[PDB]
Structures are given as structure tokens and as C-alpha cells.
Design an enzyme around this catalytic site. Structure first.
Site, PDB file in Angstrom:
ATOM      1  CE1 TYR A 138      -3.599  -1.891  -0.448  1.00  8.39           C
ATOM      2  CE2 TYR A 138      -5.032  -1.216   1.694  1.00  8.39           C
ATOM      3  CZ  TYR A 138      -4.391  -2.197   0.125  1.00  8.39           C
ATOM      4  OH  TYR A 138      -5.827  -2.723   0.497  1.00  8.39           O
ATOM      5  CE1 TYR A 139       1.721   5.091   4.444  1.00  8.40           C
ATOM      6  CE2 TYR A 139       1.058   3.104   4.692  1.00  8.40           C
ATOM      7  CZ  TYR A 139       1.014   3.750   4.915  1.00  8.40           C
ATOM      8  OH  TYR A 139      -0.301   4.225   6.175  1.00  8.40           O
TER       9      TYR A 139
END
Ligand SMILES: [Mn+2]
Length: 301
Positions: free
Chosen positions: A18-19
Site C-alpha cells: 500500500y505504501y
DNA sequence: CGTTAGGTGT
């Protein structure tokens, strides 16, 4: 255009990126995360999504005093729901290859609008007179993550609107969501996103085309072949089903969803990917200079 | 731990 994926302790390793998947992206710093939902406001969450607090809420740790017990088999414990809003492929190509921040603002506005509508579907289970009942709570805790690439390294502007598996009931208790209503309304929530995105793209001066068969739209200055060239994951899933003696219609969403992960692939600089996009677009004879306030307004009413 | 179900394919 919305997909819903249930994230449990079994498949939680799908969130590792996600990051990291947003590093060196075009518009990731102008940021790519945001807290949304009236539930998040109640928990005092706003602005950028910090990984520390995200992981806490993911496992049900609302605070040192309050920890949810959403298992009876913890392997099947549900941690949240990934609501992925993807922009049309042609919209992605114009925003990421040519470069137009205005399209990023439209996508974020359409996601935020879609999240607000989703909140009206939040439900939880209580107990009255020994019987279990259902109440509408109208609050969600949502952490959004905006990415620009697909698993096949194609331009794909999408946001992961991660809905925590928690909702505050009337009595103040945080309990697991009753997802039934949200799942039944997937297409409606996609339409909200599509309608807002189309309205904002129209206000920006983009000519759009409409497909009444699947109720979708896209940019009108891209041929069906130029879009296909930047849709490698869709091709991989079609080849995967073909290996099973199936087509996109004969197959069920249950199997088709597994063909996505099975066909999914696991180091290349972002500088390489971006240049590769331009050259390929040049090979296809794509002219991106098409924001000229023209067209027959096919996606108006 | 079931339930939704554009293909662009999270
Ligand atoms: Mn992503």
C-alpha cells in the site's frame, strides 16, 4: 468502476504494497493517502494515513482500553474491505503518460463522493430481547491509498479505499460491520464514482465515449486497440481462463477472481516504466493533445 | 464466514 476484496488474516499479505507501490509516482506527493469517513473523524483521524495507526486499527486495536474480538478461527478473522476505485484505462493513460493533474483531482473527488454514499450502508448487529437485530450506524473508518500502476506495470490510476472492519453502534461500542449491504451495492457505488468522475472530466474539456452494455465510459481519442495495448492484466486473465477452457462469460466471478491472483506476477526503476510508457504510446501512434473542448457530449445526461 | 459480480482487474 469498483472492486471489493475482503482482507482477512489469511490474505493480509496483499496489503504489503500500500505504501511502497506509490514511491516515485507522478502525483504521490501532491498526498496519496487520506483518512475518510465519519468514523475516522470520531477517532480523531484526519489528513495523511500513518502506518502505525493503520496497523493498529487493522487488527482491531482502537486504543489501549478497547480491543475488538472479531473471531470465534482467527485465520478467517476479517480485518477490512479493500474498495478499489479504478479510473478508465484511457483516463489513466491521459493522466499518467501525458500528465494532467486535473484528472487526479477528479478521481479523488469521485472517490470521496463514493465513500460518503458507502457510509449510508454501514450496519452492525445488536441484541434486543435476547434476539439479534440489525441497525444502521452511518459511520465508517476509511484509509485511502492512491496508486498509479497495475501489477503488469501499466498505467492504472486507482485508489484502495480500505474500510476497517469496525463501526460504532448507537451505544458507543465498536463492532464488526455487517457487510451484506455493502456487497450488494458494489455497482451502485461504482456508478457514483463514475458519475462524479465523468462530470468533472466534462468540466475539464475531455470528450468521452459511453458503453451502454457495461455502463462504462472512457476517453474518446483512444482506439480500442490503443487501450488494449495498456491492459496487460486483463489479457493475462483472459489467457488464464482460456487455459481452463473458459471465457469471460462462462466463468464465474469466484473463479475469475482467483485467475487474477494466480496470473499475478511478483525490480525496475520508475524512470524506466515512465519512459517505456511514452515510447509504447509513440509506437501506437497515440496523440495525447486532445483536451480541446470538443465532441458531441455522449456522456451528458 | 456465506453473501456482490463492468474487465480496466483491484
Ligand atoms: Mn494498488
Amino acid at each position: 468502476m469498483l472492486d471489493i476484496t475482503t482482507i482477512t488474516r489469511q490474505n493480509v499479505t496483499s496489503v504489503v504494497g500500500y505504501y511502497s507501490d506509490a514511491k516515485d509516482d507522478y502525483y504521490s506527493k501532491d498526498s496519496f493517502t487520506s483518512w475518510q469517513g465519519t468514523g475516522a473523524e470520531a477517532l480523531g483521524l484526519s489528513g495523511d494515513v500513518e502506518s502505525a495507526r493503520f496497523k493498529e486499527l487493522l487488527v482491531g486495536e482502537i486504543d489501549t482500553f478497547t480491543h475488538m474480538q472479531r473471531h470465534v478461527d482467527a485465520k478467517k478473522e476479517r480485518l477490512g474491505y479493500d474498495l478499489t476505485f479504478s479510473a478508465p484505462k484511457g483516463v489513466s493513460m491521459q493522466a499518467l503518460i501525458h500528465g494532467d493533474k486535473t484528472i487526479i483531482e477528479a478521481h479523488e473527488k469521485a472517490v470521496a463522493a463514493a465513500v460518503r454514499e458507502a457510509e449510508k450502508l454501514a450496519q452492525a448487529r445488536t441484541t434486543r430481547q435476547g434476539k439479534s437485530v440489525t441497525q444502521n450506524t452511518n459511520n465508517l473508518v476509511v484509509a485511502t491509498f492512491r496508486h498509479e500502476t497495475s501489477r503488469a506495470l501499466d498505467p492504472d490510476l486507482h485508489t484502495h479505499a480500505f474500510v476497517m472492519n469496525m463501526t460504532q453502534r448507537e451505544d458507543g461500542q465498536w463492532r464488526a460491520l455487517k457487510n451484506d449491504e455493502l456487497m450488494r451495492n458494489k455497482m451502485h457505488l461504482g456508478d457514483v464514482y463514475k458519475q462524479e468522475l465523468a462530470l468533472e472530466l466534462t468540466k475539464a474539456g475531455y470528450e468521452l465515449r459511453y458503453n451502454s452494455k457495461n455502463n462504462t465510459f472512457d476517453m474518446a481519442h483512444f482506439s480500442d486497440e490503443q487501450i488494449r495495448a495498456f491492459s496487460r492484466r486483463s489479457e493475462q486473465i483472459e489467457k488464464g481462463l482460456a487455459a481452463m477452457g473458459l471465457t469471460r462469460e462462462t466463468a464465474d466471478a469466484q473463479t475469475k477472481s482467483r485467475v487474477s491472483m494466480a496470473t499475478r506476477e511478483k525490480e525496475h526503476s520508475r524512470e524506466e516504466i515512465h519512459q517505456e510508457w511514452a515510447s509504447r504510446a509513440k509506437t501506437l501512434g497515440i496523440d495525447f493533445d486532445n483536451r480541446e473542448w470538443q465532441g458531441a457530449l455522449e456522456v451528458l445526461f
